Design a protein around this ligand. Structure first.
Ligand SMILES: [Mg+2]
Ligand SMILES: [Mg+2]
Lengths: 731, 745
């Protein structure tokens, strides 16, 4: 068993060797000296197996390395960016995507992924919303569990299972101004009720590791916050794994302004940080701090033991080359089977935001543009129409970017012999050249040239006037989101929106195929464009998935997981908000002396849980099996859902609960369940949710997790806004 | 003594009479909320009323006080309250504008004058000062406060309280003040009034609380509970706030009043029914119920049921009686009911002359670039200029009397204030011709204009086309020697329940501005606003920009004073002006983060920065220009190391290097370089407003002591830690000279 093996190995180690287990650089001589616990961002089973060999046969002790990577939404087969993927509301598919990424990464030497990212954000200015699962902790928690299980399985003993790492602990999504890395501040009550659940869910799913965040919390960088890294993570949640820093998290505490490298390195290990990514703080200062009494041998031994336990649980002491089978890449990476799964999941992720009836043929009743049969001349226009490299999304560091089909390429393939795909670039990404350069970093160039926006527009209008339909492929480049990609404006960029306006003016039907890593401010587009399909960034097979949706091979069933505001001046806008003492009643905007603005109502353009279908669904009234239950009781909430349109399709039936009165103020609703159903036209299904007091608990003023007696409102519907309602009492 | 008198009075009182002292109905003509009261005369007779508010006029107040004194069983006199915010009838600048004077003597003076006028007319109690810290210029109530900084906020709070109350409120021209809104109301989410507030305890104490504490320590007689929740509890039910901090920590001896229907609004907040939330309020330390009738209609039942004790009720009642006693109302119920005072104390020339001086002192010169007026002559700034020829005054703020005083002017006579055109015409009679055109409406949307001009601020929008308005303005402009573009907000685009998601000069006004600039005539933007605006376009394109906020009843004259060079602008901003609303919140006293963007390095991947704009406000905290220029020598520190017992002096020579006499606000900032928690990159810890003649120099000296270096650490201990400090002095928070020193144990 483990405790004896590790007891025995640690009794053999020098202090330098114990310190070395805590070092994660991004070398050959360091491994020989036992100064390396793991490496990251090394790609290829060949390079990795050879680094493992050195560790195993050329260090005094032969301790095997962990090999890490940001395997975030795929290894080479790229699934949608996590924010897009969350809109599937499909935990089975989400688990599957993680399973596949693990199969591919493990095939190539990787034993550890820095995933899932589970940070709640209510602030769409932050580029890293693309990396998460939206604004809601219940859904965030369910996804956290699905991802951990996908990567790790039961117990990481299979050679196609790897160690997951829940990040970024904690509260990194609340950075002020939506500006990445910026100050975070909130009450403890808000932390636990509104931000913490997804981290806790990952811990409770058995996640092997946790990554400490860049932000301060209560004026202490998270990487030195003992309350977080020990008292909450271990003391409250019983986490048995290890904590890694984010990239140079330790030395960045110097800039944060809490001390010199020795001081913050000591504070980090004393807080419960076990492994040091890149900074070399632990390696270069811990011996000196042990000599001065600033860090005890107990503390060092604990950190070391945790690293060794992780290696042992991965089976690395049984076999250092568990994940170095040179025959696996050919069998496991970028296979048709995997790519087909990615295409299926990508189509499932898209959110149909609008699909109004349009007058297509003179005299006929108006009908929607989507879906359409692939025939005639199909214009595909815009700076996202013919880019391979922008398809997979940000966070695709192992992807072969220029191997992904562009939208034009994929639609060409899918329509060959049936329709002509007519391309025009239409516009640059944005007017400002310098902006375009930074927005297309990391190999995402759109090959901007000397052609002016007027030139590009004119060419596009010529093409558009040759066509029967216009697919406007517009929005963000993939690197307008991700890390260090914060925006103060959330529009479709200037020249693209002008292009869109001019395309509409041709009188040809226009479908907006929107690429984005985040919520955008879309009021103009909602007013003027007949059809809006949010495709996020769908991964390496996005082009094919988009064709599937456009041509009706798949009926869109995605639902938003983050509010879409009308303007940046409404931020933060989130569905699970408090009522205030002066709530504006529905339809009363504007009212003086209510909580409202002079210039816009309080509502998002599209709420949490919003998404349309090529069919329609109708909800009957809610049946509650009980009108009252006590602290040990239960009841069932039941609703009949009917497919009332002409298309087979899926619906995400959403369960919300409002605690009407609290000892503290409670949100106007909270997601507490969901079921994704598939119905043929005319078919009905009674959807049942079990409601029990465990679900009704919340962190009160004293941070006691309790359900208080009183009345609750149960709401069920197609999104967080449009719901059927019923009430019951807890005694 | 007071205790004996109050003991005796309380011995006579029924439970209903003690409950009645906690009740504050609304009456009169002033509207500051939705709910209205009824049956007040009979309620007073029954002893069910402790005070009233929104009643204006000494004759009306005297009649009502005579009903209280002569016709209730016990004759207990009423408090009479009003929002006397920046003036009674003689109106000073809106508080946010006034804060830009950086002149505590003038601020105190303005409060003194307001107290003299209000007290002359029956008022014993003002709901002032508002001291809420805000970093969010979307919020309309930034107009009512003193900006984003707690040090300056605290000094202003003291100045206002002292101005209203004096030493002890004994004089008949002294009134009770009420610090509001306790607490954290300026941090409402989205900048949307009344919305959720949430923050850490450390943030509360380091960043938000000091101004409330300063008012308490100045002896403020009352505190107003805020509308927002704090830690999930409406402030009106928050016992930690209203008891533990206010009384427990700060030793407040006065009483707590709610804001307007604050108690019944807790039902909406979602913490229970009227009885439950009223019981919670009084148990928390709330003593007086504004309008809701929570206390009067439910406390007896709660007392019968054991939800509120007799000791709790007695304590709340005693606090109200103590307030009345300290104001001298038991000695003389009619102290403030001198029917002959209004004719001699209100809206006098002396008061109005002071308001005119203080208004000119409040303006902030944001830009004043050289312009070539005529070939062969070197370029000069447009401001100041001699009044001569044809001076155009154009825009929707050009000829509006009622928009001059600003929001929260509930007792002002709005249509008596001169418009800008009227004032400039008076000031230039026989010297220049004042030409006028409205030029544009306030904003394209007529429904918005209506709600923005409520409370008697109509601009008299007509059915003229934008074409008619613009063409008339262009005909004026093309005959004019200079154009005064009087643009910006209407007064009620700020104040309560006036939040904006866009902070531009409104559409049709900005279009007007573009067209005026296109004439090629020289254009001065005289900008009216209650809040920071997003002015990047204007800073690029307009030669001269004078921020006049809302100057009060004499604003038009003060504006003439500045334009014509009778006064040299010396105002400095007290709140950051963002480049766009996507940067909110911007504030100068911010943490470094772990990935600070080095100066001049925008854009850098993997630093804390945005893709589309740099991190900086257009105009930083403390920003303001003059008709002259000031230069700063290097800082001289008297020693480089001190201990906790010591002190040092930071000195710098400031020289007037320009051609005009004028004032400079010399600002002291300190950075605690290393902390056990992260510390702001700077914090204002002092200032001195100096006046220099051209060529004159002055050595400005600041005492720096360890007491100034304290902050609330992780454990909320108010401590100074040993280590390095950076002393910064300069003309605003951005442009500073630096020196370093060490603090030791
Ligand atoms: Mg309840
Ligand atoms: Mg220090």
């Amino acid at each position: 068993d483990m405790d004896r093996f590790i007891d025995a190995l640690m009794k053999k180690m020098t202090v330098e060797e114990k310190i070395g287990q805590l070092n994660l650089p991004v070398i050959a001589a360091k491994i020989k000296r036992g100064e390396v616990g793991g490496l990251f961002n090394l790609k290829g089973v060949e390079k990795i197996r050879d680094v493992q060999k050195q560790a195993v046969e050329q260090s005094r002790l032969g301790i095997p390395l962990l090999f890490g990577m940001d395997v975030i939404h795929g290894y080479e087969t790229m699934f949608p960016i996590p924010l897009g993927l969350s809109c599937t509301w499909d935990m089975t598919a989400i688990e599957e995507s993680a399973r596949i990424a693990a199969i591919e990464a493990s095939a190539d030497g990787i034993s550890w992924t820095f995933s899932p990212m589970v940070d709640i954000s209510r602030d769409p200015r932050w580029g890293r919303v693309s990396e998460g699962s939206g604004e809601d902790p219940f859904l965030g928690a369910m996804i956290a569990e699905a991802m951990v299980l996908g990567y790790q399985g039961k117990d990481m003993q299979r050679n196609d299972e790897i160690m997951a790492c829940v990040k970024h602990f904690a509260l990194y999504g609340a950075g002020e101004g939506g500006r990445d890395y910026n100050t975070v501040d909130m009450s403890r009550q808000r932390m636990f009720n509104e931000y913490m659940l997804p981290y806790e869910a990952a811990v409770e799913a058995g996640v092997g590791s946790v990554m400490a965040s860049f932000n301060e919390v209560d004026g202490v960088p998270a990487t030195a916050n003992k309350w977080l890294m020990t008292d909450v993570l271990r003391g409250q949640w019983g986490f048995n794994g290890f904590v890694v820093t984010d990239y140079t998290g330790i030395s960045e505490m110097i800039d944060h302004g809490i001390g010199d490298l020795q001081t913050v390195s000591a504070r980090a290990i004393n807080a419960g940080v076990d492994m040091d990514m890149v900074s070399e703080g632990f390696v270069s200062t811990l011996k000196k701090s042990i000599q001065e009494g600033k860090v005890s041998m107990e503390t060092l031994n604990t950190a070391c033991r945790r690293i060794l336990e992780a290696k042992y649980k991965l089976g690395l002491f049984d076999n250092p080359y568990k994940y170095c089978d040179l025959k696996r890449p050919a069998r496991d990476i970028f296979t048709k089977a995997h790519r087909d799964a990615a295409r299926r999941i990508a189509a499932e992720s898209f959110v149909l935001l609008k699909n109004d009836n349009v007058t297509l043929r003179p005299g006929t009743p108006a009908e929607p543009l989507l879906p359409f049969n692939p025939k005639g001349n199909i214009a595909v226009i815009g700076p996202l129409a013919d880019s391979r490299t922008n398809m997979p999304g940000t966070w695709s560091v192992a992807a072969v970017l220029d191997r992904c089909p562009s939208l034009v390429e994929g639609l060409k393939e899918m329509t060959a012999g049936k329709a002509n795909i007519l391309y025009a670039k239409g516009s640059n990404l944005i007017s400002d050249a310098s902006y375009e350069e930074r927005a297309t970093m990391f190999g995402r160039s759109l090959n901007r040239d000397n052609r002016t926006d007027e030139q590009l527009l004119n060419e596009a209008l010529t093409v558009a006037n040759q066509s029967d339909i216009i697919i406007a492929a517009l929005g963000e480049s993939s690197e307008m989101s991700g890390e260090s990609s914060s925006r103060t404006d959330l529009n479709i960029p200037d020249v693209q929106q002008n292009l869109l306006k001019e395309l509409l003016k041709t009188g040809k039907p226009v479908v907006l195929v929107l690429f984005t890593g985040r919520p955008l401010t879309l009021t103009w587009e909602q007013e003027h464009v007949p059809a809006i399909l949010n495709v996020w960034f769908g991964g390496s097979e996005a082009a094919y998935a988009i064709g599937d949706a456009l041509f009706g091979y798949v009926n869109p069933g995605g639902k938003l997981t983050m509010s879409f505001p009308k303007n940046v001046g409404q931020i933060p806008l989130y569905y699970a908000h408090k009522n205030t003492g002066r709530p504006l009643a529905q339809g009363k905007w504007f009212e003086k002396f209510r909580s409202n603005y002079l210039d816009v109502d309080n509502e998002p353009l599209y709420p949490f849980g919003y998404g349309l279908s090529y069919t329609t669904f109708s909800y009957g009234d809610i049946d509650l099996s009980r009108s009252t239950i006590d602290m040990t009781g239960e009841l069932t909430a039941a609703v009949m859902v009917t497919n009332t349109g002409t298309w087979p399709g899926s619906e995400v039936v959403q369960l919300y609960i409002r605690d009407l009165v609290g000892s503290t103020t409670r949100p106007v609703k909270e997601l507490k369940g969901f079921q994704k159903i598939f119905l043929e036209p005319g078919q009905s299904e009674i959807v049942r949710f079990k409601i029990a007091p465990e679900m009704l608990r919340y962190y009160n003023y004293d941070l006691q997790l309790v359900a208080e007696p009183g009345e609750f409102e149960v709401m069920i519907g197609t999104n967080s806004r449009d719901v059927k309602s019923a009430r019951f009492t807890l005694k």
